[PDB]
Structure 1
Amino acid sequence: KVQIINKKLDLSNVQSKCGSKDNIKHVPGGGSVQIVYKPVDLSKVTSKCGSLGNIHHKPGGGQVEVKSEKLDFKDRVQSKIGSLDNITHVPGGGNKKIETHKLTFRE
């Protein structure tokens, strides 16, 4: 009766880089709406019920409401732009990622 087990994950939710490295840029001249909706939502619902069990699982969702009624721009909207986002994203390293995962079993 020699029992030997190596096991990584049995019941797991792994979420990496969720809503990540994000640039949201707005240059309105006039009358502009920008909307960004990033729900990162995670649920383990384990449920045991019965016998007239009245379960009402109701996660209210998000709401966005916009009402513009009176908007007038009588004369002038002018946008003179030179330069957005001068980005040198320079990864210059000759990196070494050594990832040892070694599995020795002598029975």
Structure 2
Amino acid sequence: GGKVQIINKKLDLSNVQSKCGSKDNIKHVPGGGSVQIVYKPVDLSKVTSKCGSLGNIHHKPGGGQVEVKSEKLDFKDRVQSKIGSLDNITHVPGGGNKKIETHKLTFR
């Protein structure tokens, strides 16, 4: 037969917190001619807080059970970022700048 008996009496549990913040952040990236960002993170992380908890309760004596838990990820991505040419560019993302000049003269 078998028996799985769990008794819980007079439990006072409190202040269980799980926080994730500013994860995988790309900030303040200025490019004078161009910015090329290929942003492909694969995230299977865990931020877990457990307090007075239990897992799965399985009672299977003498069983021919087949339990399969599968998780398959296939990545065959094909990403192409292409720019032919850039010239004669003034980029001022800063503040309070004076007399910013770019000159290009061609003679043939």
Query: So what's the TM-score if we normalise by structure 1?
Result: 0.18
Percent of aligned pairs with the same amino acid: 100
TM-score normalised to the size of structure 2? Answer: 0.17
| Cα drift, residue 94 of structure 1 | 2.4
Q: CA deviation at 1:93?
A: 3.6
Rg larger in 1 or in 2?
2
Structure number with higher strand proportion: 1
Structure 1: 4+ residue segments shifted above 3 A? 1-35, 40-44, 49-52, 54-83, 95-106
- Separation of aligned partners in 2, 1:8 and 1:102: 81
Query: Which stretches in structure 1 are left out of the alignment for 5+ residues?
Result: none
1:100 is displaced (CA, Å) by 37
Residues matched between the structures, number: 106
Unaligned segments of structure 2, at least 5 residues = none
2:95 to 83, 93, 96: 93
Residues 25 and 5 from structure 1, CA distance in 2 versus in 1: closer, same or farther, beyond 3 angstroms? Answer: same
CA 1:40–1:17 in structure 2 vs 1: closer, same or farther (change >3 Å)?
farther
